[model samples]
Target: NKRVVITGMGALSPIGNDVKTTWENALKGVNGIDKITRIDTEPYSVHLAGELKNFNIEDHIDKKEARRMDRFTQYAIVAAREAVKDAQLDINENTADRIGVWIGSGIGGMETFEIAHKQLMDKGPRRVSPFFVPMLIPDMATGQVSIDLGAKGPNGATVTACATGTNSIGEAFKIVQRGDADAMITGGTEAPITHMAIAGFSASRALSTNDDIETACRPFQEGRDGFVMGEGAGILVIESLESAQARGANIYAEIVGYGTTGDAYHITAPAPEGEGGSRAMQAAMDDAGIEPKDVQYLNAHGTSTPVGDLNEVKAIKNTFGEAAKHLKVSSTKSMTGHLLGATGGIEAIFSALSIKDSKVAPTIHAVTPDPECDLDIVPNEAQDLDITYAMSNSLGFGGHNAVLVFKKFEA
Candidate 1:
């Protein structure tokens, strides 16, 4: 199999607007959840969300084109642009066809759909804009990013609920590993902070009920309620090791393994005792040909819900056995809330950075540890330790489980 490596990454997150800034914020345990500003919550009880702060679309996109695209696609194009530039990839006519784009979004264009629905209810279907269908589809983020970057290889999107980001990157890795593409611009994006969006999650009781901005989404903490919905994009530029070496690219980390599985059990809840998740994690470690103890840090899909958190802990224990106690696990979602599909993408960045710098971003708001969550959760604060391998996991609403293993790249 061809070796795949991450060359560059870009993010428009609740914590920060760019990859470097976001990494710094994550390291410092910055809290990005706050009172909702993008949409009014006068009729909603869940007033807090991880909204992108102080970000203007006009700066990264043309006004005319920006208006045509939904907020999620806008964020995706901006992030993809940054990733390509950070990789210093000169995508001329000769090289454009060898690169691809695969960006995922769990719920695309919620705001757009809400507006179109309102228009349809108030006036008629003919009143909706001609770009309604394109803007409302979940794959448009990938489509728009590929068009913006002029990449012409295999292009698609992943929509595995919260696992969308991990699945998107994992699928892109396969494309490069099989020589179907030389490089891939892949990650996840979301802009689902509309009134109806929050209301939908609220109706399902999936969102955190905590009105407190500081301690809303606490993964593994005893006082945890539920996940805080966040909206933005996280993108990475991945290429084969041979291509990266030939171009003298700055490598972040190597994509050593990918494991994706389905629970086939439930739609919203994870498999009991995290059996499905355990298989996914074990499969990833097996794919990398590494032992469970070889992984130094495991970025968890800890969404701060009651049952979800408990199930993931059981899954971890089931997968790692005695070795599970030795690994440093964390959930950056505590700070950024749950970005639905985008969570894994940003956590993937965090995992790579952990290996890059020997630092583990803490699971903030974990003041009270649940007895069932008896792992070495880097809590409340960040810690630095030399490490060789790291892993990131994402479990979505539809019982989708995805895991990625990253190894420290050595010359």
Candidate 2:
């Protein structure tokens, strides 16, 4: 099997607009959750969100083109551009066919859909813009990225709710590992902080109603309610070891294992005792040919929801066993809120960075810890540790679970 490695990464997150700034803010445990500004919150129960800060589309894409694409697609393009540039990847005619793109979004183009629906309702069907359908689909992120970058190889998208990012990256890793592509530009993006999205999540009781921005997204904390919605994109350029070495690319970490499973239990809830999540974690470790003890840090899918947080803890204990006592676990979502599909993408970046920088990002707002969550969750302050292997987990709605294991590059 071909060895897969992460060559470059890019992120447009709530805390920061790029990977460097995002990593710095994450290490500082900056809280990105704030009062909702994109839309009026008077109609909704939730008032806090993790919206992108100081982000302007024209800075990254042309004004007309930006207007043509939805926010999610625009985010994917911006992040993909940064990742491609970071990798110093030259996608000429000779290399275009060898490069592929795979990006995912859980709830894509909700903003666009709402607008189009309103237009149709107010006027007529013909009044809707022709670009509405193309912009509304979730796969447009992957399509737009491929088009923007001229990547003519395999192109695909996965829509597993919150697990979309992890599954997309994992599938892309397989593509490069199997020799189907030399490199893959992959990750997740979302712009779900729209009126309808807010209404839907609020109605479903999946969003925190807490008006306090500071504590609204406190993962693993006793007073946790529900996840705070967040919007942004996280992208990575992953290539085979030979491809990376041939170009003298800078490798952050090696992608050694990927495991995904379906809960087959509930639509909105995890399996009892997190059995599906535990299996996914074990499968990833097994794929990496490493035991649980080999993993030093875990970027958990702790969404701050009362049920999700505890279930993930149970899953970790089930998979890690005795090693669970020593594992440094942290939920970056405590700072960035829940990016939905994009959570896995940014958390994966954090996992790779933990190995590369030897620092674990903290789970901020963890003032009141829950006894059920017995793991040593790196609290408000970041910790420096020599990490060899790190695992990132993502459990989405509809019973999807995905896990990725990253190893520090030795060679």
Candidate 3:
């Protein structure tokens, strides 16, 4: 099998608009969570979301095309463009067939669905736009990305609830590793801060109702309520080691292992004691042919939900035993809120960069602690350390779990 390496990464996240800005803001402990602005929040208990600000969709696509594209697809296209440009890839007839796109969104075009439903009720079905179906599907992000980026090989998308992003990238890594594609643009995008989304999650008691933006989504903290809804996209350009070396591209890090599993226990809640999560982590570590001690930094899927946070803590302990305590584990969700499908994608970028720069982003906004989460949560401030290998974990609803191991590039 061929070795896989990341050559480019792009992100339009809650904390920042690009990979560079996101990394800097993450290290600076900048908080992006705020009261909702795109849509009014007064009608619901959940009034806060990590909504994007000052982002002009027309800057990336023409208004005519933008009107037909959902916010999620729009984010994906912009991020994918940045990733391709960052990789400095020259895709022509020779290379186009060997390039692929895989983008996933947990909930696609929710805003479109909401608007279409409103139109259907207010003005009948004939009033809805003709582009509603195409714009509402989850796979359209991948479809639109393939069209926009001119990639022809292995185009697809993965939908694994919140694990969508990680699973998509992991599958893309395997596609290149198997020699089917020379490079793959893969990640996740989401625009789920909609009225229905907020209402549904709030009704299920899955979102933080706290009006205080600063302390709302406090992962691994005693007062943690639930995840704060956020919206964005994260994309990466990954190719085989040989392909990257042939082009003399800048290698960010090597994707050494990927693991995915299901709890088969609960639809939303994690398995008791996080047994499934432990197995997934162990599986990835095993696949990477490395011991748990080899990992120095971990981008945790700590969504700030009370049970979810502690369960992941236990999974780490179960997988690493005593070594778990020293790992610099941080849930960037603390700063960016939860980007849902896009969460894992951006966190993977963070994990790879942690290896590239030896700087671990902090899990900010935690003051009170939960004894159950006693590990080094990398609270409040970034730390520079000699990291050779790192991991990113994402667990979603329906017991889907995906974890990736990235190693520092070496000759």
Candidate 4:
């Protein structure tokens, strides 16, 4: 198998617009959650969300282009531009055949669907925007990204709910690892902050309606209520290790393993014993040629929900045994809120940054860690630890679980 490595990372997250800014804010435990300002939430139970502050989508895309794209696709394009720029990719002069895109979303074009659906019902079918169909489709991300970036090779989008991001990246990793491509622009984007999206999750009692948006979405704290609905985009430039080395590209980390599984059980809840999550981790370890003890750090799928947080801890224990005791685990969701489909992308970038920067991020808002969920939670502060390898977990609805493994690459 050809080696695969990440060369660039870009993020427009609830916490910060870029990965560095996000990292800095995350270390300080600065929360990005705020009152619902995008739309009036007077009638909703969840009045809070991890909304990006002071974001002007117009600044990133032209008005014409922005109008034609859904908010999710727009975020994807913005983040993809960042990633391509960071990778120094100029598709105008570069070969599009060598470049590919694999972006994913749990739910796509939600804002567009909400608007067009309302327009159709409140007005008439004729009132629906012409761009409505293209805007609301999940695969539009791939189509738009491919068009904008001029990438024509093996283009697609993965949509496995929360596991979408990880699975998307895992799919990209294989494309290079199997020598099918030399470089791939891959990641995830989401903009599901619509009224219906928020209300649906809220009605299911799945949101942390904490009035204090800043300190809400606690990932493993004793007072944690539920996950916060967050929207953002994350992108990574993945290339063959040989190509990166040949070009002397700055290497962030190598994709060591990718694993995915399903519980075939509950639709929203994790498997009873976290069987699927554990299986995903074990599969990743097996692929990485390492045991649980070899992993030095972990960026967990600790969404801070009561059952979710504790179940992950048990899964970790099952995967690593005594080694799990030494691993530092944390969730940025404690600060950035849950990005859902985009969570894997944002967290994947965090895992890669852990390798490049040599400092493990913290699980902010973790004031009192639960005994059951004790793997050192990274505990609300940044630690400058020399990490060699790290893993990120993303579990979505329908018991879909995906695991990604990364090892620091010294070029």
Steric collisions counted per model: 0, 0, 0, 1
lDDT of 4 by residue, 1-411 (tens): 988999888898888988888877877877878887888898887888888877898898889889999888888888888888887765644567878999998999888888888888989999888888899999898889889989876788889998888999999999988888788888888998898898888888888777876567788778788888889988999999888877667888899999999889898898976889999999998998889988888898888788888888889899888888789887888877888888899999999988888888888777776677777888778888888889999987889999999998855
Query: What does the lDDT read for residue 43 in candidate 4?
Result: 84
Tens-digit lDDT string for candidate 2 (1-411): 999999889899999999999999999999999998899889778889999999999997889899989999999999999999999988989999999999999999999989999999999899999999899999999999999999988899989999999999999999998899999999999999999898898888898899987888889999999999999999999999999999999999999999999999999988989999999998998889999989999999999998899999999998889999999999999999899978889998999999999999999998997998888999899999999999999997999999999999988
The weakest ten consecutive residues by lDDT in model 3 span 51-60
Model 3 accuracy (lDDT, Cα):
0.91
- Error in Å for residue 365 of model 3: 0.9
Best by lDDT: 2
Task: Predict model 2's lDDT versus the native.
Answer: 0.93
Candidate 4: worst-modelled 10 consecutive residues by lDDT: 87-96
Give residue 153's lDDT in candidate 1 (0 to 100): 87
TM-score, every prediction: 0.99, 0.99, 0.99, 0.97
How much lDDT does each candidate structure score?
0.91, 0.93, 0.91, 0.86
Instruction: Please list the residue runs of candidate 3 whose C-alpha ends up more than 4 Å from where it truly belongs after superposition.
Output: none
